[PDB]
Design a protein around this ligand. Structure first.
Ligand SMILES: CCn1c(=O)[nH]c(=O)c2c1nc(Cc1cn3c(n1)CCCC3)n2CC1CCC1
Ligand SMILES: [Fe+3]
Length: 279
């Protein structure tokens, strides 16, 4: 039988709370403040605005300044076009952490996408289900200040700088939504291939633009070291093709062993369409 899946945008209430400086208990207190905020959030709520600490803003600022040096030569065209929009409209500054609420309202206007806070990792099914309603489950906390440039888990710096500028792009938002739509009620096996295709496009994808390799994966756009690595000569690069890409292991603790190149967002979407027919 078909497993449960959300039928309307507020149905994400019943799956977004199904969550699946590490010896710093002060940081842990701060982290669970953020966790409770997301757990208590219900669809329709304004996303709670947070007063980030001076330490957190400094971390964001250290991440922001270094990444902005790399984006002109590394990030895809669409990313470069929307990032200034977010600076004008959502307060993307070195000295200010944008609020999820403001970014959510900006995205609703540009592509209909919206943000919902999440405490931690959901199942691939639950996480991809939000995309079907143009809802991106986003973390709200800031990484630990001892290491601004590496984080084991994604934080709001990764969401705001990695994911958000592409969610503002209609062609990308369509692609993302169709990943989630295909996932709704699909088999566990089918969810796992869709999540892997998501991983190697939304999170770690490359694209070719005017003969040049550029990055659009959010996990690259928020990682100073892997961003440079991906466009270096050290990187194994293969064409995006869902039937092989879905067989690739998604690495979490290291650099990816391979990065997949899409011809364009429209082309990755068409390839996804053919692939979901067969699954
Ligand atoms: C499709 C896989 N997947 C999943 O199965 N359940 C999730 O909940 C999830 C997720 N993928 C993300 C987004 C994500 C994960 N990573 C990055 N972005 C960039 C750095 C590498 C790891 N999430 C939600 C966030 C996890 C904290 C909430
Ligand atoms: Fe991500």
């Amino acid at each position: 039988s078909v497993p449960w899946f959300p039928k309307k945008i507020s149905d994400l209430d019943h799956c977004a709370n199904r969550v699946l400086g590490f010896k710093d208990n002060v940081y842990r207190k701060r982290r669970k403040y953020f966790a409770d905020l997301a757990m208590n959030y219900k669809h329709g709520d304004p996303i709670p605005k947070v007063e980030f600490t001076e330490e957190e803003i400094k971390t964001w600022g250290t991440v922001f300044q270094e990444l902005n040096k790399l984006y002109p030569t590394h990030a895809c065209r669409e990313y470069l076009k929307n990032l200034p929009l977010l600076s004008k409209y959502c307060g993307y500054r070195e000295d200010n952490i944008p609020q999820l609420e403001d970014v959510s309202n900006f995205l609703k206007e540009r592509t209909g996408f919206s943000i919902r806070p999440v405490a931690g990792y959901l199942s691939p099914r639950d996480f991809l289900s939000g995309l079907a309603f143009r809802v991106f489950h986003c973390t709200q906390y800031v990484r630990h200040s001892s290491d601004p440039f590496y984080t084991p888990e994604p934080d709001t710096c990764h969401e705001l700088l990695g994911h958000v500028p592409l969610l503002a792009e209609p062609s990308f938002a369509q692609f993302s939504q169709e990943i989630g739509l295909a996932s709704l009620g699909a088999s566990e096996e089918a969810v796992q291939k869709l999540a892997t295709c998501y991983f190697f496009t939304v999170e770690f994808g490359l694209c070719k633009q005017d003969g040049q390799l550029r990055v659009f994966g959010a996990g690259l756009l928020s990682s100073i070291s892997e961003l440079k690595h991906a466009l270096s000569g050290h990187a194994k690069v293969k064409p995006f093709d869902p039937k092989i890409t879905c067989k690739q292991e998604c690495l979490i603790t290291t650099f990816q062993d391979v990065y997949f190149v899409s011809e364009s967002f429209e082309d990755a979407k068409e390839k996804m369409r053919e692939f979901t027919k067969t699954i």
